[PDB]
Amino acid sequence: KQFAVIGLGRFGGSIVKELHRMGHEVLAVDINEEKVNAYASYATHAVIANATEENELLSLGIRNFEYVIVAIGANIQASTLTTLLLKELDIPNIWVKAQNYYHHKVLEKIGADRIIHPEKDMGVKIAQSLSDENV
Amino acid sequence: NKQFAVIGLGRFGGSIVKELHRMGHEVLAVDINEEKVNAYASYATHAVIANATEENELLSLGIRNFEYVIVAIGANIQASTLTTLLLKELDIPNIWVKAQNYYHHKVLEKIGADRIIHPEKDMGVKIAQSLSDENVLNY
Amino acid sequence: NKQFAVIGLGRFGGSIVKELHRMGHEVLAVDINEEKVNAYASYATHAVIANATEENELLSLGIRNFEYVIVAIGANIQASTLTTLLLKELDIPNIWVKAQNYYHHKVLEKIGADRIIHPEKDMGVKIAQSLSDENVLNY
Amino acid sequence: KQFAVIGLGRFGGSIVKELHRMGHEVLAVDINEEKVNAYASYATHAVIANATEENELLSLGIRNFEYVIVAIGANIQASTLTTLLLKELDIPNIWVKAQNYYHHKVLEKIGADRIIHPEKDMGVKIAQSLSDENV
Amino acid sequence: KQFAVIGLGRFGGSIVKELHRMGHEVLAVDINEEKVNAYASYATHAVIANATEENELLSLGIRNFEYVIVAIGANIQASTLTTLLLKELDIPNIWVKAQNYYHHKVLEKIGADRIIHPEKDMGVKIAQSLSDENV
Amino acid sequence: NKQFAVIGLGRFGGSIVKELHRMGHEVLAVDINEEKVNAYASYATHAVIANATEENELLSLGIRNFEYVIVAIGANIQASTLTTLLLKELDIPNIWVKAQNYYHHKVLEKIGADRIIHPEKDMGVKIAQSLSDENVLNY
Amino acid sequence: KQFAVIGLGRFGGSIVKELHRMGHEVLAVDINEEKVNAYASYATHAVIANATEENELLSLGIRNFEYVIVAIGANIQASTLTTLLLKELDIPNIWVKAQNYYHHKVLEKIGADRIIHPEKDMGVKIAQSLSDENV
Amino acid sequence: NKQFAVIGLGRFGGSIVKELHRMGHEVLAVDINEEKVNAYASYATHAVIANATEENELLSLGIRNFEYVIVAIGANIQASTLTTLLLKELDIPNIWVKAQNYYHHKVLEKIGADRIIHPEKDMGVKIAQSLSDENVLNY
Ligand SMILES: Nc1ncnc2c1ncn2[C@@H]1O[C@H](COP(=O)(O)OP(=O)(O)OP(=O)(O)O)[C@@H](O)[C@H]1O
Ligand SMILES: Nc1ncnc2c1ncn2[C@@H]1O[C@H](COP(=O)(O)OP(=O)(O)OP(=O)(O)O)[C@@H](O)[C@H]1O
Ligand SMILES: Nc1ncnc2c1ncn2[C@@H]1O[C@H](COP(=O)(O)OP(=O)(O)OP(=O)(O)O)[C@@H](O)[C@H]1O
Ligand SMILES: Nc1ncnc2c1ncn2[C@@H]1O[C@H](COP(=O)(O)OP(=O)(O)OP(=O)(O)O)[C@@H](O)[C@H]1O
Ligand SMILES: Nc1ncnc2c1ncn2[C@@H]1O[C@H](COP(=O)(O)OP(=O)(O)OP(=O)(O)O)[C@@H](O)[C@H]1O
Ligand SMILES: Nc1ncnc2c1ncn2[C@@H]1O[C@H](COP(=O)(O)OP(=O)(O)OP(=O)(O)O)[C@@H](O)[C@H]1O
Ligand SMILES: Nc1ncnc2c1ncn2[C@@H]1O[C@H](COP(=O)(O)OP(=O)(O)OP(=O)(O)O)[C@@H](O)[C@H]1O
Ligand SMILES: Nc1ncnc2c1ncn2[C@@H]1O[C@H](COP(=O)(O)OP(=O)(O)OP(=O)(O)O)[C@@H](O)[C@H]1O
């Protein structure tokens, strides 16, 4: 039921807007206040927080969500520390955006339930979308 | 026969080439970098080394003959817009382009791109969709 | 009344503004840089500070009302193409743009520029013409 | 009668092509061989030379021309040394492309007969071209 | 008994030379051949390998060692993937050089037995060395 | 009283300051950056903001009065060598310096550094020692 | 009798201090106010001015000096425009610091009475100073 | 015989080599750049290509045998200080060095340079002297 998105970049921010459009409630979070404001109107709650800090993770209630998506970008360290922590809180489903090959490999062994690769995944989508031309 | 062609064998471009191959489709794969072209020899019917911004090289490829041509050039807005510009000249039925940002999208719309892809954002909506399906479709 | 507008008050843009003033024509002068706008206050009917790439700022200027609009933005192909892109949307009767190179020229042709200026090259032909006149016209 | 162009950049190169199209003979010169080749077909003679070197200027015969245009670009020093030398050879008309304000001022006091400013000059041309709309 | 050092930088390379001087046998490994050669004379065996690749880790016999030190530097991703893999092979003691705060935190939760911080640790050493002045 | 002074509150410098405090020793902590000086106010008897390369600022600090002065300046070989150069002038009984590389070490030896620290390498030998102790001392 | 120094860099500034030490009066000038202040105590008069501007050159009285040294540095254009102007005012002796080979060549043809090359000239000085070891 | 050696054949270094030759003195000219070494073959008894910062290369040159050695390395304070550091080790009777700035001067004083040259400033005093002579000596 619950949906929480950590990291409001193009990928993460986009999934927050879609959840909203599809009439779903979503907790949006990011360390950058500016980022949090840009999506405040699309989320039930938009909170400024460093997903690395366990104390901020608890005062956030993140442990109460069924699905938490980690969409941190360039900061690969924050990304794996964050999923490591969500895994300690036993979040049912934690999906993570993988920055690169090594990142996927660490995430796989860390406890991420689904690893997302925008570029590659969108690529197979377009290939299947190309075939559909004659379906 | 000569239905699909992909220019730019990066993560995105190369991925559409592999998937097409897996689905048993013929695919023309091109890049300016030879190391990229050699990495996709086992997936493309033909994998040629060429500069998509060169009008002559586009003829030596036969591109004017494909129904769909994907411009998957990355961090080079210039090479990307130039290329789709040359493709529209050869009146390609369908030219799809990976956009880098809002600026790039704006020029591609007017320059001839029939479809514009924004991997990050677009994948975001599909992830939202998968999440909704987990609960709504009761999956 | 509202016949000419020049966006980009560099050497080229500012020069067309001054000459127009000298010829007694009304001219709308714009730049994003205030120091540039203040340097042309004595030559333009109105000298406004604005970012030509912003759709809102283009309305707050009234640009949709001019017959000729010159995009004289320099070393910023992006700001330049974006701007002429917004101008064509507002259906400007005549939009003239200073091109930076071959690539820039190619996008401007398809994006809406009615005339494209290449200062260096273009001035070269006129200099050739002046040389021919020195001898041919016996001057 | 004679026309010689020193510096085959966009400005200089362009005036060589126009002279040719208008059926005129022109001596084209530049220090960069590649540049000289790009315009070899448009000039009666295209020669590789450093216009700074007096010896190369004489083995070039530059002193025999009525009009010599100095179209050196960024190398402002070469530009003023070159016009200084052409002035010593008493060339009838020496026209020079001015790089900036100080450059114009030195050229003016050095002996350049006409100082050309592409950007500014093309600017008044466009202003006059704009008026002509109702002429 | 067994000692294996992954990453032959200043830190890792230095521990290999000391083990040798103290008459100990040590397996030295690095992805850069040049690095491996610089320490070939100090180790019983010096092998070129990407510690990220499980296949290279096995053809290396790394699983047979009692102590394996991961001294990768700037490549923080390789560093945590490498310790993650050594942990899967159940190496008795795996000591890791921590690049920064987040890195220590991930390493701590990953299975590193000892986390080393050259700068900080050498710092307390000097403080204790300063006191000893009057001991 | 005025026994230890540490210039440069980076990872290395700040660490010696904290440990000294933990051991109950008085310590003079200095840095040019105020944010660094404020981060160590709870560990140093006195935490002053100063540029160790300035002869005047070194007098306003009283440095000539300490038995041991640690130059823990990092990625600034110049600020580092200059500083130890000024310290040797004031005839400091003991001046210890963190070296950045072989070049830096070579100049520090001749410029007056009584002891030169190479964190990475030096820590490497101690780690080797700990490993030997695990087996040799049967620990 | 009169001495004026234009450009208070290491070279120009140094000649102002020496003239002062040797009990001579000197007019010091530079476009940068900070520069002018750094030598205000060594000159009879220290004035802020752009030596390129003829109006500033006259309100300066520069034309009344017997020796004017142009010590502009990187701004080679200002340097040659400035000597060109001092030459129009017919200054008896104008000495100029040459930035490079082309610069010397233009200066030579412009009217500079003496061209100074710190690096090269100091070089022959040291060679002669080396010989003197056995003189 | 083996009286003078100059390391660094830039404007300054090369100039001392030429003048020495003109005065009929033997001179050992060295540089790391071959194009610089070839430009001074007609002025030096011996013009060798070597890296003055390498202890071995300094022995293969015989430098320990010269009374005067000039370090005329330019925009490389490191190569400059390192070199004079190695020269002082070989106990050179006289080592003269071109300084780049105040910082460089300060390290050279303590590292072994017997004389330090600051071209710009130093030439400034000589120019002042020439000016005084024009009037004072009534020249
Ligand atoms: N420790 C953290 N806790 C919470 N949010 C974080 C943390 N670290 C980074 N973020 C946020 O995650 C987001 C990272 O997405 P990112 O900025 O890398 O995408 P982008 O660069 O904006 O564009 P793209 O998606 O194409 O890479 C940023 O908005 C950033 O503020
Ligand atoms: N002018 C060109 N003609 C043909 N191919 C080109 C041209 N310019 C670039 N390419 C190729 O297109 C690809 C661009 O993708 P990119 O440079 O962003 O690498 P990538 O990051 O792995 O791809 P992606 O951004 O999808 O992850 C490269 O393989 C590059 O060699
Ligand atoms: N987005 C923009 N909107 C409006 N004006 C702009 C914008 N971007 C740049 N300009 C202005 O346009 C002018 C660009 O000309 P440029 O930057 O090349 O200086 P310039 O070299 O003197 O002009 P020129 O190239 O003709 O000699 C500048 O005055 C700049 O401030
Ligand atoms: N000393 C010289 N003698 C002869 N030719 C020279 C000399 N110095 C420079 N040139 C030539 O003059 C030309 C300078 O024009 P330039 O290259 O600056 O224009 P550009 O940079 O190509 O484009 P633009 O005209 O817009 O500045 C060059 O082709 C250069 O090789
Ligand atoms: N995946 C890997 N497998 C094996 N070795 C690796 C791997 N990745 C990096 N290394 C090696 O680990 C070492 C990293 O240490 P590093 O180079 O960062 O220290 P340094 O930069 O040389 O100096 P410092 O210790 O002060 O940082 C390198 O020699 C590198 O080749
Ligand atoms: N001239 C100076 N005088 C006094 N302090 C200085 C001076 N220059 C730099 N410092 C300080 O010395 C410290 C240098 O350490 P550094 O810049 O390498 O940061 P760091 O990496 O955290 O330290 P370390 O290299 O030990 O990890 C900084 O806190 C810096 O502000
Ligand atoms: N047009 C001008 N009129 C008056 N003074 C000028 C003018 N242009 C430059 N200057 C001054 O001339 C001086 C140039 O000397 P310069 O700064 O190049 O030497 P430096 O860079 O400080 O060190 P060095 O002498 O080794 O090059 C500067 O102080 C500058 O402010
Ligand atoms: N490590 C070295 N050993 C020997 N020679 C060196 C070394 N490093 C640099 N050099 C040489 O010393 C000279 C340095 O002078 P520089 O780089 O400043 O050129 P320059 O500007 O013409 O000399 P100057 O500053 O006197 O005008 C160069 O010829 C360079 O090749």
Swiss-Prot record, chains A, D, E, G:
GO terms for biological process: potassium ion transport. Disruption phenotype: Impaired potassium uptake. Keywords: Cell membrane, Ion transport, Membrane, NAD, Potassium, Potassium transport, Transport. GO terms for molecular function: identical protein binding; monoatomic cation transmembrane transporter activity. Residues 1-116 form the RCK N-terminal domain. The keyword Ubl conjugation does not apply. The keyword Transport applies. It comes from the Bacteria. It is a peripheral membrane protein. NAD(+) binds at residues 10, 30-32, 50-51, 72-74, 97-99, 103, 119. GO terms for cellular component: plasma membrane. It is found in: Cell membrane. Homodimer, tetramer (dimer of homodimer) and octamer (tetramer of homodimer). Part of the KtrAB complex formed by an octameric catalytic ring of KtrA and a membrane associated dimer of KtrB forming a potassium channel. Belongs to the KtrA potassium transport family. Catalytic subunit of the KtrAB potassium uptake transporter. The 2 major potassium transporter complexes KtrAB and KtrCD confer resistance to both suddenly imposed and prolonged osmotic stress. This is Ktr system potassium uptake protein A. It comes from Bacillus subtilis (strain 168). The lineage of its organism: Bacteria, Bacillati, Bacillota, Bacilli, Bacillales. The gene is ktrA.
